[PDB]
């Protein structure tokens, strides 16, 4: 629960990061302080820009551009499949990835588009088996 | 790095939550998408409202009030010590708590005011020894 480590006098909390993400997912479930809608083939997904930027290289690049920083709606490539995006948005807020035989190619394609390198790497590992 | 668990078919990522928090702290360091300033005895601290709400019962209560939701400046009780607040803001974004003999009473008092129950519990454990 707590531990100490070398070269650093601070107390380390093992559960804090998971608790923060859990509470951020609760905010999303309740639509509290969400500040962007992502549009994927007419499907709409509400989210927190900071969480998107902390998980996706695409969204990091988008919202660090001064012109795009304050946009409230982001339209993605119409070829992106909404189910794949939904799975990856859930992953962002949960650390849990719904990979199945029937969606892994779409999830991998969407994670490459979003620049989510650890999801892509994981997809390639499962494909190889 | 990855694991499976019962009652849930999804892949579990062990490092994701810590990576999200690390990237959120990077956004804070760069002042990217910060949306509130907390004022503590004339000292000013920039932060992300969603992270404050995910860590502090006080900030959760504040920003779920419709009148206070869009405030850009929050003034805290003038008796709160800025060093204690700084230590707890760092903890929110890092899972690391700078507890010392010389600050533990102030940090505990500030964590009670912010309603950060796991920090308070930890302070009481260290005090008892
Ligand atoms: Cl990733
Ligand atoms: Cl806490």
Numbering used by the authors:
A (entry chain A), B (entry chain A): -1 to 127
Sentences from the paper on this structure:
Here, we report the functionalization of the BTB (bric à-brac, tramtrack and broad complex) domain from the transcriptional repressor BCL6 to serve as a promiscuous assembly block that may assist the crystallization of a guest protein. The 129-residue BCL6 BTB domain forms a symmetrical strand-exchanged homodimer that contains two lateral grooves that bind corepressors with high affinity. We showed that these can mediate the formation of a variety of highly porous lattices, and that a guest protein may be incorporated into a BTB-domain lattice by its genetic fusion to a corepressor peptide that binds to the lateral groove of the BTB domain with high affinity.
Crystallization of both the BCL6BTB/NCoR1BBD2 complex and the NCoR1BBD2-BCL6BTB chimera was favoured in conditions of high ionic strength, and the crystals had similar cell dimensions and the same packing in space group P6122. In the crystals of the BCL6BTB/NCoR1BBD2 complex and of the NCoR1BBD2-BCL6BTB chimera, the NCoR1BBD2 sequence simultaneously interacts with two regions of the BTB domain: the first is the β1 strand located in the lower part of the lateral groove of the BTB domain and the second is a region we refer to as the hydrophobic patch (HP) located on the surface of the BTB domain between residues 60 and 72. A peptide molecule thereby tethers two BTB dimers together in the lattice [Figs. 1(c) and 1(d)].
